[PDB]
């Protein structure tokens, strides 16, 4: 398991890749097909990823592009916001 140890920066760093734009969909896809069966984005993770990594160089073109887009909501909360020097 990872430790994760108090002291960093809060600097916002998570804007999501190709791989979760691809699992955020899969799931939604599923979710509305059954909305009464939990499709909960851990156990739904390796149903989604098995099939991330069997798609081709089209397949994901698509969630890289839109993966590109997602920095845009993570741009503007870095560049303004100032973080601790490591005190």
């Given at each position: 398991?990872?430790?994760?140890?108090?002291?960093?920066?809060?600097?916002?760093?998570?804007?999501?890749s190709?791989?979760?734009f691809?699992?955020?969909?899969?799931?939604?896809?599923?979710?509305?097909?059954?909305?009464?069966?939990?499709?909960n984005?851990?156990?739904?993770?390796?149903?989604?990823?098995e099939?991330?990594?069997?798609?081709?160089?089209?397949?994901?073109?698509?969630?890289?592009?839109?993966?590109?887009?997602?920095?845009?909501?993570?741009?503007?909360?870095?560049?303004?916001?100032?973080?601790?020097?490591?005190?």
């Open positions: 398991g990872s430790h994760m140890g108090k002291g960093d920066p809060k600097k916002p760093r998570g804007k999501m190709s791989y979760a691809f699992v955020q969909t899969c799931r939604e896809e599923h979710k509305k097909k059954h909305p009464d069966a939990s499709v984005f851990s156990e739904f993770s390796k149903k989604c990823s099939r991330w990594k069997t798609m081709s160089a089209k397949e994901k073109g698509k969630f890289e592009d839109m993966a590109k887009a997602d920095k845009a909501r993570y741009e503007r909360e870095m560049k303004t916001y100032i973080p601790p020097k490591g005190e």
